[PDB]
Design a protein around this motif. Structure first.
Motif, PDB file in Angstrom:
ATOM      1  N   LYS A 225       0.809  -1.218   0.000  1.00  0.00           N
ATOM      2  CA  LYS A 225       0.000   0.000   0.000  1.00  0.00           C
ATOM      3  C   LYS A 225       0.845   1.272   0.000  1.00  0.00           C
ATOM      4  CE  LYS A 225      -3.781   2.312   2.692  1.00  0.00           C
ATOM      5  NZ  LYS A 225      -4.741   2.095   3.822  1.00  0.00           N
ATOM      6  N   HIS A 226       1.972   1.254   0.731  1.00  0.00           N
ATOM      7  CA  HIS A 226       2.761   2.466   0.893  1.00  0.00           C
ATOM      8  C   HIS A 226       4.210   2.236   0.461  1.00  0.00           C
ATOM      9  CE1 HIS A 226      -0.460   4.428   3.268  1.00  0.00           C
ATOM     10  NE2 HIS A 226      -0.525   3.321   3.997  1.00  0.00           N
ATOM     11  N   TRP A 229       7.111   4.409   2.113  1.00  0.00           N
ATOM     12  CA  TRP A 229       7.479   4.403   3.535  1.00  0.00           C
ATOM     13  C   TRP A 229       8.801   3.657   3.662  1.00  0.00           C
ATOM     14  CZ3 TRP A 229       2.710   3.004   7.189  1.00  0.00           C
ATOM     15  CH2 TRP A 229       1.672   3.954   6.966  1.00  0.00           C
TER      16      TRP A 229
HETATM   17 ZN   LIG Z   1       1.396   5.654   1.011  1.00  0.00          ZN
END
Ligand SMILES: [Zn+2]
Ligand SMILES: [Zn+2]
Ligand SMILES: [Zn+2]
Ligand SMILES: [Zn+2]
Lengths: 263, 71
Positions: A225-226, A229
Motif C-alpha cells: 500500500k505504501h 514508507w
Molecule cells: Zn502511502
C-alpha cells in the motif's frame, strides 16, 4: 488459511486491494518445499553446506513459515533462504550468509523464525547492516517462557534493530512458552497455526516461529500500500498502532493491527 | 567448539586480505562476508590466541548454533 489472518486485521488490507504484490520476502529457515501448488517461491539460495537445495525442506518449519507470510500477504513474492538444516539448526555464519544474500538481492523483508540464548557480534553486524539497507527485519522472540524478572528473548530477536515477535493464542492471551523481556516488540498469533507442510500437507505448528511471519506478512501488506514508507516507518507503524494487551515485559506494544498500521 | 567467526578492523575489506591474516596464523578460511567485516574459519586453540592478539583482528567468536523456534 489460518485464524491468525483475521486476528491481525489483514483482511482490511485485502479489501482495499493490497495483498503484498511486488514485495519480496525472504524466509531464512530450513528451505521452502516445492511440494506446494502455490507458494510462488520466486527464488532462493542455500547456505547449509551439506543441504544445497533451498526448495527441499527436510525439517518442515521453513515451509510452514512461508505459508503464513502468504496467508497474510497472498501476492507477495517469497524467497527460500536455507540457513537451517534438517535438524532445525544452523551456524551463525550460514545465517549471516543468508542475510547478506537478502541485502544483495534487494529483499524488502527478512523473516527469521530462529534463535539462540547467546549472541554473536557478526550476526548483530549483519542484521544492523540489513536494517541500514532499508530491509524490515523480523524475528521470533523465543520459546523460553518466564525466568524470574530476567529477559528470555533469544538472539537475533534480542537486538534493538530487529522486531522481536512473541506469541499469543486466538484469545489474545500470551502463550506459556512465549519469551519475555524489555526486548519484546509486538505479538502475533503463534498457537496451533495452520499452514503449509512438506509432502503437500497442512497442519498446526506452535511457537514464536509461527508468530513472526504474521508480522513479516503485515510488513509486506503495508509496503504494497505504501511503497514510499521506509523500513523505520513500517516498523514504527506496526509498533505504534498495536493493540495493547498488558505488561510490555510480556506482550511488548501488544498485538499487531495491520488495518491501523496502514493509512 | 573449533568453528569461529573472525572479525576485522578497518582496511581488510577484500577476502584475500582477510584470508591472509587467518592463514598466517594457522587457521583455515571457510567464507568471507560481503558487508559484515568478518569471515568464518576453522581454528585450533593456538590460532584463536594468535588471531585475538593480531592488530588486524577486532574479535574472535564461536560460530554458534541457532535453532528453529517451532515445536
Ligand atoms: Zn502511502
Ligand atoms: Zn483476504
Ligand atoms: Zn499448497
Ligand atoms: Zn528487538
Amino acid at each position: 488459511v489460518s485464524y491468525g489472518v483475521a486476528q491481525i486485521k489483514a483482511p482490511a488490507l485485502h479489501s482495499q486491494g493490497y495483498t503484498g504484490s511486488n514485495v519480496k520476502v525472504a524466509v531464512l529457515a530450513s528451505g521452502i518445499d516445492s511440494s506446494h501448488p502455490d507458494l510462488n517461491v520466486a527464488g532462493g539460495a542455500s547456505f547449509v553446506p551439506s543441504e544445497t537445495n533451498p526448495f527441499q525442506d527436510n525439517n518442515s518449519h521453513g515451509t510452514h513459515v512461508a505459508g503464513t507470510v502468504l496467508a497474510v500477504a497472498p501476492s507477495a513474492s517469497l524467497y527460500a533462504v536455507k540457513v537451517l538444516g534438517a535438524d532445525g539448526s544452523g551456524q551463525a555464519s550460514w545465517i549471516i550468509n543468508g542475510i547478506e544474500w537478502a541485502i544483495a538481492n534487494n529483499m524488502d523483508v527478512i523473516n527469521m523464525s530462529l534463535g539462540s540464548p547467546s549472541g554473536s557480534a557478526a550476526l548483530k553486524a549483519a542484521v544492523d547492516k540489513a536494517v541500514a539497507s532499508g530491509v524490515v527485519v523480523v524475528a521470533a522472540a523465543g520459546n523460553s517462557g518466564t525466568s524470574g524478572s530476567s529477559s528470555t528473548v533469544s538472539y537475533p530477536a534480542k537486538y534493538p534493530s530487529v522486531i522481536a515477535v512473541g506469541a499469543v493464542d486466538s484469545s489474545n492471551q500470551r502463550a506459556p512458552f512465549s519469551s519475555v523481556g524489555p526486548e519484546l516488540d509486538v505479538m502475533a498469533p503463534g498457537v496451533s497455526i495452520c499452514s503449509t507442510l512438506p509432502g503437500g500437507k497442512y497442519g498446526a505448528l506452535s511457537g514464536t516461529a509461527m508468530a513472526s511471519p504474521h508480522v513479516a506478512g503485515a510488513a509486506a501488506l503495508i509496503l504494497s500500500k505504501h511503497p514510499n514508507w521506509t523500513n523505520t516507518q513500517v516498523r514504527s507503524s506496526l509498533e505504534n498502532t498495536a493493540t495493547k494487551l498488558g505488561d510490555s515485559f510480556y506482550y511488548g506494544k501488544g498485538l499487531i493491527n495491520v488495518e491501523a498500521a496502514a493509512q | 567448539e573449533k568453528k569461529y567467526i573472525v572479525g576485522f578492523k578497518q582496511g581488510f575489506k577484500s577476502c584475500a586480505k582477510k584470508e591472509d591474516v587467518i592463514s598466517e596464523k594457522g587457521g583455515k578460511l571457510q567464507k568471507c562476508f560481503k558487508y559484515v567485516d568478518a569471515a568464518s574459519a576453522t581454528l585450533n586453540e593456538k590460532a584463536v590466541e594468535e588471531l585475538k592478539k593480531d592488530p588486524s583482528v577486532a574479535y574472535v567468536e564461536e560460530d554458534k548454533l541457532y535453532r528453529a523456534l517451532s515445536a
